[PDB]
Design a protein around this ligand. Structure first.
Ligand SMILES: CCCCCCCCCCCCCCCCCC(=O)OC[C@H](COP(=O)([O-])OCC(O)COP(=O)([O-])OC[C@@H](COC(=O)CCCCCCCCCCCCCCCCC)OC(=O)CCCCCCCCCCCCCCCCC)OC(=O)CCCCCCCCCCCCCCCCC
Ligand SMILES: CCCCCCCCCCCCCCCCCC(=O)OC[C@H](COP(=O)([O-])OCC(O)COP(=O)([O-])OC[C@@H](COC(=O)CCCCCCCCCCCCCCCCC)OC(=O)CCCCCCCCCCCCCCCCC)OC(=O)CCCCCCCCCCCCCCCCC
Ligand SMILES: CCCCCCCCCCCCCCCCCC(=O)OC[C@H](COP(=O)([O-])OCC(O)COP(=O)([O-])OC[C@@H](COC(=O)CCCCCCCCCCCCCCCCC)OC(=O)CCCCCCCCCCCCCCCCC)OC(=O)CCCCCCCCCCCCCCCCC
Ligand SMILES: CC(C)=CCC/C(C)=C\CC/C(C)=C/CC/C(C)=C/CC/C(C)=C/CC/C(C)=C/CC/C(C)=C/CC/C(C)=C/CC/C(C)=C\CC1=C(C)C(=O)c2ccccc2C1=O
Ligand SMILES: CCCCCCCCCCCCCCCC(=O)O[C@H](COC(=O)CCCCCCC[C@@H](C)CCCCCCCCC)COP(=O)(O)O[C@H]1[C@H](O)[C@H](O)[C@H](O)[C@@H](O)[C@@H]1O
Ligand SMILES: CCCCCCCCCCCCCCCC(=O)O[C@H](COC(=O)CCCCCCC[C@@H](C)CCCCCCCCC)COP(=O)(O)O[C@H]1[C@H](O)[C@H](O)[C@H](O)[C@@H](O)[C@@H]1O
Ligand SMILES: CCCCCCCC/C=C\CCCCCCCC(=O)OC[C@H](COP(=O)(O)OCCN)OC(=O)CCCCCCCCCCCCCCC
Ligand code: HEM
Ligand code: HEM
Lengths: 203, 52, 92, 535, 139, 52, 223, 37, 55
């Protein structure tokens, strides 16, 4: 125990030196996100089959999408992605507290998006459309609510990473953790853009 | 000019050396062995169904 | 580095010279570490006997009796294997 | 002038009496700061909450089987014949402000009391806090646990209810009346005659508000006095020996943290009394022998006795013109369970041979046979507890009721053995892990050696390092070892500014340097005290 | 990472071709027009491989030729400090058990066992992630 | 290589396999039994109406 | 009605003749004969969905109905005409009565429920376990007509409560109690299911005890 | 295998590093006949 | 927070629609969470006091 057998100032460090080598955590996160893309592909297939088998009026008469509440939430999610990227820049720097600020506002805006989605869910359920109520209702709820579960998972990842940064000193390991969490958030917002363009505009 | 080896390698090992590894295993080699044993157990379980 | 080594003198009092050894149980001196093998053999045999005896009961069922038979059989097989191996010096 | 008033009151106290020396001894008494030593405090605090809520409940409860039509406020039970006990329990629930909350927090406090007694028993048994000294403390603690079990049994049976009255009819009546030589005589003397005798609930009320709680209070006083004057044992550590107590003094730190823990425990109990529904007696209609539900379970502490009743395989003996019902089997089983629990320390000392005065606990891994036996016993207890719940387990988790019953029957001899073997081997493997850490240092990230492609985990030794790379192995000292550089001085100094914004560099450097100096001072003090004791 | 990126680029080319041809030959020459399930699955597996290949290509252009990618690379060239590979840990089994308790809660429609399995999963994932960051206890 | 990229993750993968596999086998202990529908588990036969 | 009978026959012939043989006689060892079961039995069973049954097991589980109210009525009319038996209640208009089956007295309904229903179901209509793979299901999904018809025709391992045994007024009171107990909010917090001891003990051990142990670990020092 | 799979690594030149390691003489041969097929 | 929650307990206990409400009645929702509010306020108050003391 003279000084240390492992000449490192962090019990946990980057899994490989990322300057010359790929970041293993980033590579794994990217691959897993590419798989989650196929999960959402299955959901999209369900939705598109229902759309094709609909008899012309794809959103049934009882259902009526609320763009007034669907445009603000997607705009807020895009803003959350931008703030998450700013936090990523902070993490690339040594700016622990800048990363914390950016990720906190990102978490707040993601929570606002989740609450807006829940409000639209409540309004839609009140106005007839329901999972058991109709095929459109069910496919729409499956797609958008599985995305909402993914957003909740991203929120959990955000708070968990923030706790990690609180409890241990900022290092390339935590910077990479923030980077991969941001990759997940960007994937979530991209699939939300796809779902918005499909559900609301394309219909 | 000669090596002092055991007459035979250790057969099994001391009591209580594997059980905690399995729970805390992080060596891919041990995990791969756990896969092979567990997967083969399901082969016997699944294979017994075919006999019925 | 921010850790201090520990010095411990616990009062000892069987003297562990017979039974289990540190090579088999590293903390043999620190606490009760040896259960006589006869105890476990007899316990397994009595557990198998109890499982078999539960067949006698007020149940018209038969898969229950067969499950009891199977579990008692595997218990007896384990006890017999252990006893035989220790008799021969842990061979085969 | 609060300071003047305090000084004058201290002078008055020390003039009227002379408690200076005794009070100083109490304040200077050192208590180890291990978390597992607060498990008994949980039970003590839950007991205090139980007393406080029980007084309030007694102010409103009327024990009697005197039949009455409700004519209260709860509409779904109106004009239905019920006992005064049930009627006043309903009155507490509905027609008394906060009465539902008080009774719910009372029942939740009872459940936490039982659970914390069980956890404290596990702690002491597995750490060996009973051998040579404190063995009588363990004995009276076992009596205390039994008394708590039966106290809760009489408590949730106190409001004459369908569920609890069915539980009484099963256990108190059938088991008591099945006992061979004096079973019916005990039944008639407890119930003042047949089962629905008009004195059962008043007798249980006496037993539950005064008699059994009085004995529990006396035994808790004896328990705490024994812990106080037979200084609390401690885990092996740097400066901890069999002839000292390393920890914190009563006055500044221990007292404040114990009071805060009491506050937090009562907060948890109140939160659960509010947010979680316990014993909805209004849903559970008044007791009638002809009515019953499908659940029919006792509280989780008597659930193991009920599970024993369910699982035991209907073995009845019929001597010459007599019957020996299956109730005697479970009665003898409970007797054996309690006898073994009470007499374990003496059984353990007779078996092993250790009567040495033990003040240093032993980690459960360091005693494979005892931790194995405790794991086996906990497995049997869990098996019985879930056997009692097999009805709801079968209902919700789709498993046939016969299958659950026979799973319990077979497991209660198979599962204890499996858990014994697994726990024994697990303890020995924890010892092996400790030894490997001692002889090789903590594990870290892998490094590829320069000349060749060797991979080495780049360990970190915990002791003096030999001239070459490998360290001098240390000797196990009965204390936990750090298996992660995480928990050592490695990557543990985040910017001390705030969650959102930093602080000035001068302040951060001052704070971190002061903290590092304090850690050095503490470690050096422990090291020097250890050297002085062992040299 | 040229070959690593080019593998996914080839997969992207093939999957894009498959998606396009399937979409065309299902819009025309199918009983009910575009299938809308195979088409979407092919499009988004093209997206899977496209994302992976694009990231790999970005990294290949960002990083100089690694010893691993370099033929005639000596072992000493790559010899050095490999990063942190997690040693023994018992959090994975707890995560698996928590997710299994959520899964059985979903199968047997028990909202209470779903709610608890999810709590369980959050706790165990927090434990796994914080395993090597929980600073020394400060007393 | 010395180990897999995420050696705690591959440990989770094995345990997810083991416990995920067990709860599928668990259909047998239920009174109804395991899944009637074949391995393919075609849609109409799998809905709550069929194989409930 | 002629067309109602014809529709019931057409649904029967392509739904259940494989296990309730044509002519309504039961297929030996696949299904019982439906002669005498009546319209109430058909309504309850098919509406709860148990009858499009795709396995012979300990108990036929509930499931989404395979027929809409009109087809349920068609099948019930067909079975009633073939066999003749109990009929589902109906309101003034003609639809299956739902609110009319809510008996006025709830204390009487609860007493009757405890004497007869709680025996196996629960204190408040949650489920209960039975001998070999069977179970009394939760009543919170059943609507008043379903509860009334369940009593009227003992579906499976359930005693058959005739009108003579439980006058329709008593059955209406029991229905009122069932619906009231199902729709009534838990006073005092979250009723953990409806079973007291077991859900309460689990919630103690998981919520209160983990909180206490975690707080103790926070306050104290590992060693 | 030792924990971490290796105390050494041979010169990696082809798809058979261990064959080259154990039979150095074949190294030239494995290249000479490779293209003949 | 402990003090504010204690004051909340006091105010809720003194002024809240307690008392049983028969069924499906206006005020049944308030009654259903009357007792939960008592427990929430009380437990939160004393728990926050304990957390402050521990800190
Ligand atoms: C009820 C349940 C609730 C919890 C209660 C249990 C708490 C127990 C903790 C014990 C703490 C304790 O007693 O400390 C007191 C402690 C007495 O012991 P000490 O001072 O160390 O004396 C030397 C040793 O006792 C000498 O002892 P030793 O260290 O040499 O070992 C001998 C020991 C041997 O060990 C034992 O066997 C001890 C265990 C006793 C067994 C059972 C006895 C307790 C039964 C309790 C039943 C309760 C119901 O025997 C004893 O000391 C027995 C003492 C019995 C007292 C038990 C108190 C309860 O000191 C004090 O008296 C300090 C308090 C001063 C009070 C005056 C303050 C100002 C006066 C104002 C008055 C009015 C103001 C108006 C103006
Ligand atoms: C659908 C099922 C969802 C599966 C989601 C998990 C799969 C992700 C695996 C690939 C990601 C890359 C990776 O290797 O993970 C690292 C890590 C493996 O650690 P390792 O092997 O020891 O190596 C060190 C790491 O490479 C060192 O990197 P690291 O430890 O720092 O990892 C960074 C981020 C790694 O990046 C991520 O994994 C992104 C997180 C996105 C997942 C969000 C869930 C979306 C699904 C919800 C709808 C269903 O770690 C975080 O700080 C955020 C983790 C937040 C996970 C939240 C999951 C909660 C699920 C319950 C949601 C409740 C709502 C439903 C009701 O995996 C995780 O931490 C995820 C735990 C697995 C959760 C399974 C849930 C069952
Ligand atoms: C409802 C209340 C909120 C629920 C969430 C509370 C959990 C957050 C705190 C957990 C971390 C912690 O205690 O350490 C930080 C720190 C403890 O510092 P320390 O003990 O002096 O040093 C710890 C060493 O680093 C020693 O480090 P270590 O690696 O040996 O382990 C550190 C720590 C945590 O290490 C872990 O194993 C990490 C995983 C636990 C985090 C759980 C987060 C998600 C929980 C969601 C739902 C919980 C169920 O160990 C614990 O598990 C502590 C007990 C907390 C268990 C939480 C419930 C299970 O505590 C705090 O910052 C405040 C804790 C206040 C006490 C409350 C804990 C129990 C209440 C939760 C159960 C309630 C059930 C009803 C729902
Ligand atoms: C609707 C309705 C009726 C609602 C109310 C519900 C009801 C009926 C009752 C509950 C209501 C109440 C009154 C709740 C609060 C209960 C209560 C007294 C909580 C106190 C906790 C609190 C407020 C702490 C504030 C924070 C703070 C500054 C703490 C430091 C100062 C304090 C309070 C120190 C208290 C120390 C303490 C717990 C003394 C307990 C005395 C007893 C019985 C034993 C002492 C003792 C202890 C505590 C050991 O641990 C121990 C361990 C080993 C050997 C011996 C001992 C020993 O003798
Ligand atoms: C605490 C739990 C751990 C227990 C540990 C002990 C392990 C040993 C388990 C022993 C299993 C015994 C199973 C046999 C039991 C038996 O004899 O009953 C039978 C039913 O067979 C079965 O399914 C057998 C199922 C066996 C699966 C056991 C699964 C073990 C699980 C529980 C382990 C997970 C534990 C989770 C731990 C949680 C930890 C909590 C912290 C028949 O009933 P029945 O249904 O009436 O069948 C009639 C026909 O017979 C008749 O022809 C026909 O006519 C019909 O009438 C038909 O009904
Ligand atoms: C940590 C402290 C916090 C404690 C939790 C406190 C939660 C407070 C909730 C809000 C205030 C009280 C609401 C009372 C209103 C209310 O009661 O809540 C039911 C919901 O009920 C459910 O389903 C459960 C839904 C899932 C969410 C709650 C799960 C919490 C569990 C996990 C807590 C215990 C811990 C156990 C750990 C388990 C793991 C063990 C290893 C909702 O109605 P419903 O759903 O329709 O009930 C059906 C009648 O209708 C119908 O007739 C009747 O027949 C029934 O079917 C009935 O369910
Ligand atoms: C690897 C083994 C592989 C064994 C695999 C066999 C699986 C086949 C089982 C059931 C198939 C469905 C039939 C279902 C009906 C049953 C057949 C029958 O009728 O067989 C005649 C009598 C009962 O007559 P009963 O009329 O049912 O009436 C009775 C009262 N009234 O039983 C007998 O003698 C013959 C015994 C019949 C089954 C007993 C099987 C139980 C468990 C075996 C061992 C468990 C081992 C555990 C190890 C730890
Ligand atoms: C009402 C029930 C109980 C209460 C109030 C209680 C209280 C306490 C407290 C506060 C301690 C000191 C703190 C600690 O060691 O955690 C303690 C120690 C002890 N308890 Fe109990 N406990 C109870 C049940 C039991 C049971 C069931 C047993 C068996 C038992 C045996 C012991 C022993 C042997 C000690 C000494 C531990 C030591 O000296 O370190 N207690 N008890
Ligand atoms: C010593 C440990 C004690 C335990 C484990 C315990 C347990 C219980 C339990 C579980 C109940 C059922 C509450 C309900 O169903 O709502 C109960 C009821 C009751 N307890 Fe205790 N109790 C204890 C001490 C006391 C004390 C000291 C008193 C009096 C000061 C008391 C007075 C009462 C009363 C009057 C009832 C009836 C309340 C009702 O019917 O709702 N208890 N007890």
């Amino acid at each position: 125990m003279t000084s240390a057998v492992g000449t490192s100032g962090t019990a946990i460090t980057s899994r490989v030196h990322s300057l010359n080598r790929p970041n293993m955590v980033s590579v794994g996160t990217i691959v897993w996100l590419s798989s989650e893309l196929m999960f959402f592909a299955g959901l999209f297939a369900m939705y598109f089959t229902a759309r094709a088998q609909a008899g012309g009026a794809w959103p049934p008469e009882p259902t009526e999408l609320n763009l007034a509440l669907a445009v603000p939430v997607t705009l807020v999610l895009i803003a959350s992605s931008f703030t998450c990227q700013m936090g990523v820049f902070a993490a690339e720097r040594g700016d622990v507290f800048g990363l914390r600020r950016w990720y906190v506002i990102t978490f707040l805006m993601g929570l606002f998006f989740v609450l807006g989605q829940g409000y639209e869910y409540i309004h839609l359920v009140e106005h007839g459309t329901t999972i058991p109520g109709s095929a459109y209702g069910s496919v729409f709820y499956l797609a958008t609510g599985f995305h909402g579960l993914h957003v909740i998972g991203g929120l959990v990842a955000f708070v968990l990473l923030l706790a990690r940064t609180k409890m241990s000193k900022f290092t390339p390991a935590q910077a990479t953790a923030a980077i991969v969490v941001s990759y997940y958030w960007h994937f979530v917002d991209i699939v939300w853009i796809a779902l918005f363009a499909t559900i609301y505009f394309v219909r | 000019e000669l090596e002092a080896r055991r007459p035979f390698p250790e057969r099994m090992g001391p009591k209580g050396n594997l059980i905690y590894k399995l729970i805390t295993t992080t060596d891919h080699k041990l995990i791969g062995i756990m896969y092979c044993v567990v997967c083969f157990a399901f082969f016997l379980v699944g294979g017994l169904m075919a006999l019925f | 580095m921010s850790s201090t080594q520990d010095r411990s003198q616990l009062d000892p009092e069987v003297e562990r010279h017979t039974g289990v050894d540190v090579e088999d149980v590293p903390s043999a001196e620190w606490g009760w570490s040896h259960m006589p093998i006869g105890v476990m053999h007899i316990g397994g045999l009595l557990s198998a006997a109890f499982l078999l005896v539960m067949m006698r009961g007020n149940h018209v069922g038969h898969v229950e009796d067969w499950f009891l038979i199977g579990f008692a059989a595997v218990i007896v097989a384990l006890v017999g294997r252990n006893w035989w191996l220790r008799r021969r010096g842990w061979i085969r | 002038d609060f300071a003047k008033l305090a000084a004058a009151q201290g002078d008055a106290i020390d003039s009227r009496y002379h408690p200076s020396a005794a009070v100083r001894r109490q304040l200077n008494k050192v208590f180890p700061t291990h978390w597992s030593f607060l498990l008994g405090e949980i039970a003590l605090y839950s007991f205090i909450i139980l007393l406080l809520t029980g007084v309030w409940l007694t102010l409103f409860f009327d024990p009697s089987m005197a039949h009455v039509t409700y004519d209260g406020v709860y509409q779904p039970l109106r004009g239905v014949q019920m006992s005064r006990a049930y009627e006043t329990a309903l009155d507490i629930s509905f027609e008394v402000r906060g009465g539902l909350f008080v009774r719910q927090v009372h029942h939740w406090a009872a459940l936490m009391f039982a659970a914390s007694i069980m956890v404290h028993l596990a702690r002491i048994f597995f750490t060996g806090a009973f051998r040579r000294p404190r063995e009588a403390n363990w004995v009276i603690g076992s009596l205390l646990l039994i008394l708590a079990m039966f106290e809760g049994f009489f408590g949730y049976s106190l409001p004459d209810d369908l569920l609890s009255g069915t539980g009484i009819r099963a256990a108190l009546s059938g088991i008591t009346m099945g006992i061979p030589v004096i079973g019916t005589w005990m039944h008639w003397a407890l119930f003042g005659g047949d089962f629905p005798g008009e004195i059962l609930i008043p007798r249980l009320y006496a037993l539950h508000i005064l008699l059994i709680p009085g004995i529990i209070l006396a035994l808790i006083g004896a328990h705490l006095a024994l812990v106080w004057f037979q200084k609390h044992t401690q885990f092996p550590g740097p400066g901890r020996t069999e002839t000292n107590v390393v920890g914190v003094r009563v006055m500044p730190v221990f007292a404040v943290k114990s009071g805060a823990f009491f506050a937090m425990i009562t907060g948890v109990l109140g939160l659960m009394g509010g947010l979680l529904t316990i014993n909805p007696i209004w849903n559970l209609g008044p007791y009638k022998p002809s009515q019953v539900s499908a659940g029919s379970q006792p509280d989780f502490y008597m659930m193991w006795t009920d599970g024993l009743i369910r699982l035991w395989p209907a073995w009845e003996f019929y001597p010459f013109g007599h019957t020996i019902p299956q109730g005697v089997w479970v009665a003898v089983g409970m007797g054996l369970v309690f006898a073994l629990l009470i007499a374990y320390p003496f059984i353990e000392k007779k078996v092993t041979g250790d009567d040495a005065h033990h003040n240093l606990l032993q980690r459960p891994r360091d005693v494979p046979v005892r931790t194995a036996i405790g794991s086996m016993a906990i497995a049997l207890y869990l098996l019985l507890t879930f056997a009692c719940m097999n009805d709801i387990i079968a209902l919700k988790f789709h498993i046939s009721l016969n299958a659950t019953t026979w799973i319990g029957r077979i497991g209660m001899v198979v599962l204890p053995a499996i858990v014994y073997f697994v726990a024994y081997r697990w303890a020995i493997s924890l010892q092996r892990s400790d030894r490997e850490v001692l002889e090789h240092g903590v594990e870290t990230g892998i490094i590829k050696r320069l000349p060749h492609g060797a991979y080495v985990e780049l360990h970190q030794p915990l002791g003096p390092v030999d001239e070459h790379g490998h360290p001098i192995p240390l000797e196990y000292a009965g204390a936990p070892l750090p298996k992660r550089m995480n928990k050592l001085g490695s990557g543990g100094a985040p910017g001390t500014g705030s969650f959102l914004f930093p602080d000035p560099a001068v302040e951060h450097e001052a704070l971190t340097e002061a903290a590092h100096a304090s850690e050095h001072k503490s470690l050096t003090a422990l090291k020097e005290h250890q050297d002085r004791i062992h040299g | 990472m040229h070959i690593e990126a080019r593998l996914f680029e080839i997969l992207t080319a093939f999957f894009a071709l498959a998606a396009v041809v399937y979409a065309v030959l299902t819009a025309m020459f199918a009983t009910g027009g575009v299938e809308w399930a195979g088409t979407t699955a092919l499009v988004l597996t093209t997206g899977l491989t496209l994302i992976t290949g694009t990231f790999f290509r970005f990294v290949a252009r960002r990083l100089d030729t690694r010893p691993e990618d370099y033929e005639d690379a000596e072992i000493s060239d790559g010899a050095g400090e490999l990063g942190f590979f997690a040693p023994h840990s018992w959090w994975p089994i707890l995560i698996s058990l928590s997710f299994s308790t959520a899964a059985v809660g979903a199968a047997l429609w028990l909202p209470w066992l779903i709610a608890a399995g999810v709590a369980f999963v959050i706790t165990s994932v927090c434990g796994l992630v914080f395993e090597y960051y929980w600073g020394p206890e400060k007393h | 290589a010395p180990d897999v990229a995420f050696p705690r993750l591959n440990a989770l993968s094995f345990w997810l396999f083991l416990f995920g596999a067990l709860i599928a086998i668990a259909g047998f202990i239920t009174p109804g039994g395991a899944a009637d529908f074949g391995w393919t588990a075609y849609s109409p036969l799998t809905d709550a109406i069929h194989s409930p | 009605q002629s067309a109602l009978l014809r529709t019931g026959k057409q649904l029967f012939e392509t739904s259940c003749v494989s296990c309730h043989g044509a002519n309504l006689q039961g297929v030996p060892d696949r299904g019982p004969s439906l002669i005498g079961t009546g319209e109430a039995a058909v309504y309850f069973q098919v509406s709860t969905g148990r009858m499009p049954a795709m396995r012979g097991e300990a108990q036929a589980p509930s499931k989404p109905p395979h027929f809409d109210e009109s087809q349920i009525d068609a099948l019930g009319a067909y079975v009633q005409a073939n066999g003749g038996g109990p009929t589902v209640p109906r309101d003034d208009h003609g639809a299956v009565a739902q609110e009319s089956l809510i008996g006025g007295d709830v204390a009487r309904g609860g007493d009757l429920f405890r004497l007869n229903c709680a025996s196996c179901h629960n204190f408040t209509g949650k489920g209960g376990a039975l001998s070999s793979g069977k179970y009394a299901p939760d009543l919170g999904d059943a609507n008043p007509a379903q509860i009334y018809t369940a009593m009227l025709t003992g579906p499976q391992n359930m005693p058959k409560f005739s009108d003579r045994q439980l006058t329709p007024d008593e059955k209406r009171d029991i229905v009122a109690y069932v619906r009231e107990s199902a729709e009534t909010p838990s006073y005092g917090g979250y009723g953990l299911g409806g079973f007291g001891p077991a859900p309460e003990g689990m919630a103690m051990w998981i919520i209160g005890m983990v909180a206490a142990i975690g707080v103790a670990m926070w306050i104290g020092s590992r060693a | 295998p030792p924990r971490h799979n290796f105390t050494e690594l041979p010169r990696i030149r082809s798809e058979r590093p261990a064959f080259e390691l154990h039979y150095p003489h074949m190294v030239e041969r494995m290249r000479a006949e490779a293209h003949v097929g | 927070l402990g003090g504010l929650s204690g004051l909340a307990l006091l105010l809720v206990f003194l002024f809240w629609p307690w008392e049983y409400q028969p069924f499906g009645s206006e005020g049944e929702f308030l009654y259903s969470l009357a007792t939960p509010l008592y427990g929430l306020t009380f437990g939160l108050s004393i728990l926050s006091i304990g957390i402050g003391a521990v800190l």
